[PDB]
Design a protein around this ligand. Structure first.
Ligand SMILES: N=C1C[C@H](c2cccc(Oc3ccc(Cl)cc3)c2)CN1
Length: 300
């Protein structure tokens, strides 16, 4: 993990990057800010190339589409709280998700959006913007404080609130027991395993495969080949993670490394060639008047 590049936000006393994802264009990183702006930066030069105001509150998440034509955003207290933006020719808003606090694309074919409102998942058609399904069973809920509904790699399962749903039947097939208060779970890209905080479960048998204590309270990201798993722990805007990330072998969940960057972490993401890890790091403490974040680029 060699440092390659570092930059702060242009024309800012105090630097406000909150989250990042690589653009479909090679050398260019998208970043959200605490004033609800989307910015496009040269990740090597640190030159700000473009700026749009998407929301009148801080960006909490973004995800570009694989084909570079679409972008999802989520903000903090703005209405609408999340939105879908078009990026071909002019930048403009296509649809808005009035109360969804988090949104993701479908993974296999990026024709659908899945949004989260508290305990409840919503699915949307991208063309029409219509709500196709609501996935919510109050007898099966876990009430995860940081619930984030997500499609599996083939788009036919959904994890919401520790419940596995079958998208075609709108049927709850399994509720995983609650073993923490905050983390709801992601799908392994291999389509066989789901990862919920420190537990790894099998999708065909529901047997526990692994305990990984160092994942506690971590947000999980995979590299694009699905051979490496990165973990950023949430904190005991304000700083969403503490100051270290762990890397694990994705097939056997053995630790490769614990990197301590000595700064609280806001976000991290991989490029599509698994060449680079981009990390948002706060130089200030939680008690500073203002945020002071930088984006560091590391070679992996
Ligand atoms: N109203 C408009 C829309 C248009 C415009 C202005 C600035 C920037 C831009 O592209 C961006 C911005 C942010 C990201 Cl992350 C990616 C691309 C488009 C010209 N005028």
């Amino acid at each position: 993990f060699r440092p390659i590049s570092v930059f702060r936000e242009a024309n800012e006393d105090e630097s406000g990057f909150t989250c990042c994802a690589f653009s479909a264009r090679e050398r260019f990183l998208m970043l959200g800010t605490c004033t609800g702006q989307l910015k496009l930066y040269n990740v090597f030069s640190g030159q700000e190339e473009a700026s749009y105001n998407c929301h009148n509150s801080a960006i909490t998440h973004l995800e570009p589409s694989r084909d570079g034509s679409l972008l999802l955003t989520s903000a903090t207290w703005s209405q609408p709280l999340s939105a879908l933006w078009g990026m071909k020719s002019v930048f403009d808003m296509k649809h808005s998700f009035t109360e969804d606090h988090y949104v993701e694309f479908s993974k296999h074919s990026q024709d659908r959006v899945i949004g989260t409102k508290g305990d409840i998942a919503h699915i949307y058609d991208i063309q029409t913007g219509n709500k196709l399904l609501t996935l919510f069973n109050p007898d099966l809920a876990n009430n995860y404080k940081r619930n984030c509904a997500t499609f599996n790699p083939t788009d036919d399962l959904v994890l919401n609130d520790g419940v596995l749903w079958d998208v075609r039947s709108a049927l709850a097939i399994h509720k995983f027991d609650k073993f923490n208060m905050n983390i709801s779970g992601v799908f392994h890209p291999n389509g066989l395993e789901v990862i919920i905080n420190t537990e790894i479960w099998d999708l065909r048998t529901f047997h526990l495969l692994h305990t990984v204590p160092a994942l506690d309270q971590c947000r999980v990201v995979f590299n694009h080949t699905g051979t490496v798993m990165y973990g950023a722990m949430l904190q005991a805007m304000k700083s969403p993670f503490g100051s270290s990330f762990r890397t694990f072998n994705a097939t056997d969940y053995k630790p490769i490394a614990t990197i301590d960057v000595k700064r609280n972490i806001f976000d991290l993401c991989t490029d599509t060639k698994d060449c680079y890890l981009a990390v948002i790091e706060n130089q200030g403490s939680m008690d500073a008047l203002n945020m002071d974040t930088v984006c560091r680029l590391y070679e992996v």
